[PDB]
Amino acid sequence: SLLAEFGDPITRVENALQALREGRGVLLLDDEDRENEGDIIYAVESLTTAQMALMIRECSGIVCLCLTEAQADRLALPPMVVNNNSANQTAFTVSIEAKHGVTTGVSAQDRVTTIKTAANPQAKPEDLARPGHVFPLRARAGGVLARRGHTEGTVDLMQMAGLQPAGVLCELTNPDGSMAKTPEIIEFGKLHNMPVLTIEDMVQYRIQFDLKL
Amino acid sequence: MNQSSLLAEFGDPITRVENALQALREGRGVLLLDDEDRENEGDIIYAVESLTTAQMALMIRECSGIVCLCLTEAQADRLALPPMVVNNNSANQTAFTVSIEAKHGVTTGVSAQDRVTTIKTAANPQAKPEDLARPGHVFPLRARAGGVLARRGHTEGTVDLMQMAGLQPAGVLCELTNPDGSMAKTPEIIEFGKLHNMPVLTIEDMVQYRIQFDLKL
Ligand SMILES: O=C(NO)[C@H](O)[C@H](O)COP(=O)(O)O
Ligand SMILES: O=C(NO)[C@H](O)[C@H](O)COP(=O)(O)O
């Protein structure tokens, strides 16, 4: 009901895709009975220090880099934990840092440097120190049709938009520390020209338009 | 405009440590600077045993958001939290363990209330490994035996401060960040302290104090 302000589910996806093509961010909500959380998403292709700074200012600050299994393997990033027993099996790899061009790794600029370094299609494992202050996530093969996570949503959006299949995500957080919920996510999107969409929107879009990716 | 001149208003090095200990006993935060030729960063530090949702929320608002839990090696061991990486090649060998979530009493783990729950669960000296799920959204750090007299890091400074204050040896830390995303330096750290009632001290302050009054912790 609140989401209708951003259009019908297909329109909501199209507007998100176009925002990403224009180098802008989007807000992605998962199922209400899952995390019921909204994440800011940026395309790595066009990622700027300003965008990263905004993400740190407005979100959890635990900025994650969503990668394909193939890119994660290229980087030799094993899962952070052999036996993952997190509630949602969040696919955290070992954390990373650019080995060149950063200092402590935590500044907005430094995180962008690390992210650009990792997402590079010609990247090598030795391009990244471990541990670091950027947190890669392995997207499941099949994307949101196989796992209904923001992780898959991020990589799927990039692929659907024709962009570098790597994106950054972080959870929108209210000033008092509680997580933004649907009305706050809607308001944020309207205030800051960021399309809002849901995982279910993406699932319907992909099935409807026969998008194999 | 050197650091010692700027910091003088917080008192002499010994006064600066004594004020930080007092703040922690009163359940307030402190701001800890490491060496200017090291990270040259200021971290907010809180004691775990008095940690509140509001304190955590401030860290999320104003710091990197990668909020770390400084633990003794014994505590990390009882939680089954070895180093995240066998062969750590990060710039200053930051002793990250794998990340953690409370097994019970949290949802996604990332809210201020959830992080506090996870941190208090992890810092409990009777905790068992099954009390935590991995990976998570709280990042534990293994402090070096010997504290700042073994490693001049915020990690050690955090645990040493709790011990010197007579609190349980667990604290949380996060790096203060400027609104433009850059990391806060001594002038901005000083202003933040005076805005948020946090005393400011340095690792060198701590080292000099321990050498004079607390060689063994
Ligand atoms: O918890 C996370 N990051 O720390 C998650 O990657 C993000 O918030 C949502 O992840 P998921 O929806 O793919 O499980
Ligand atoms: O990078 C970190 N945490 O993410 C460090 O724990 C924090 O910046 C201070 O670490 P230090 O113990 O090397 O001074």
Q: Tokens representing B57? A: 């929320």
φ/ψ region of B76 (left if φ > 0, alpha if ψ in -120 to 50, else beta) reads alpha
A 169-188: CB under 8 A from B: 171, 173, 175-179
- CA-nearest of B23, B68, B64, B16 to B162 is B23
Q: Is the peptide bond before B83 cis (omega within 30 degrees of 0)?
A: no
- Is B114 marked as binding a ligand? no
- CA-nearest of B73, B98, B100, B75 to B85 is B98
Q: Tokens representing A194? A: 């960021």
- Using DSSP, state whether A92 is helix, strand or coil: strand
Angle (CA) B77 B121 B217, round 5°: 55
Give, to the nearest 10 degrees, the angle between helix A49-58 and helix A108-119. Answer: 120
- CA-nearest of A73, A103, A135 to B137 is A135
How many domains is chain A partitioned into structurally?
Answer: 1
- Note the resolution in Å, 1 decimal: 1.9
- Is B39 marked as binding a ligand? yes
- CA-nearest of B198, B75, B207 to B141 is B75
CATH number at A79 reads 3.90.870.10
| Ligand 2 pocket: which of B34, B96, B141, B148 to mutate (most atoms within 8 A of CB) | B141
d(CA B55, CA B24): 13
In order, the DSSP letters of A114-171 are: HHHHHH-TT--GGGEEEEEEEEEEEPPTTGGGT--SHHHHHHHHHHHHTS-S-EEEEE
- Using DSSP, state whether B174 is helix, strand or coil: strand
Q: What is the CA radius of gyration of chain B?
A: 16
- Spatial CB neighbours of B207, under 8 Å, sequence gap ≥ 6: B148, B149, B152
- CA-nearest of A90, A181, A55, A54 to B111 is A181
A47 touching B (Cβ < 8 Å):
no
Ligand 1 binding pocket includes A123 (Cβ within 6 Å): no
Helices (H), B124-179: 154-164
d(CA A64, CA B180): 19
> What number does the ligand 1 atom closest to the CA of A35 have?
12
Q: Please name the residue that has the structure tokens 């790899």.
A: A93
Ligand 2 binding pocket includes B155 (Cβ within 6 Å): yes
Q: Are B69 and B123 in contact (CB under 8 A)?
A: yes
End-to-end CA distance of chain A: 29
For chain B, count helices (H), then strands (E): 8, 7
A 60-119: CB under 8 A from B: 60-63, 80-81, 84-87, 90, 92, 94-95, 97, 99, 103-109
For residue A181, CA distances in Å to A30, B102, B111 come to 11, 22, 12
Q: Which of B108, B113, B173 to mutate to test binding with chain A, by most A CBs within 10 Å of its CB?
A: B108
Q: Are B69 and B98 in contact (CB under 8 A)?
A: no
Experiment type: X-ray
- CA-nearest of A99, A101, A79, A106 to A90 is A79
- Using DSSP, state whether A38 is helix, strand or coil: strand
Ligand 1 binding pocket includes B151 (Cβ within 6 Å): no
- By residue range, what is the domain housing residue B144? 1-217
d(CA B43, CA B154): 7
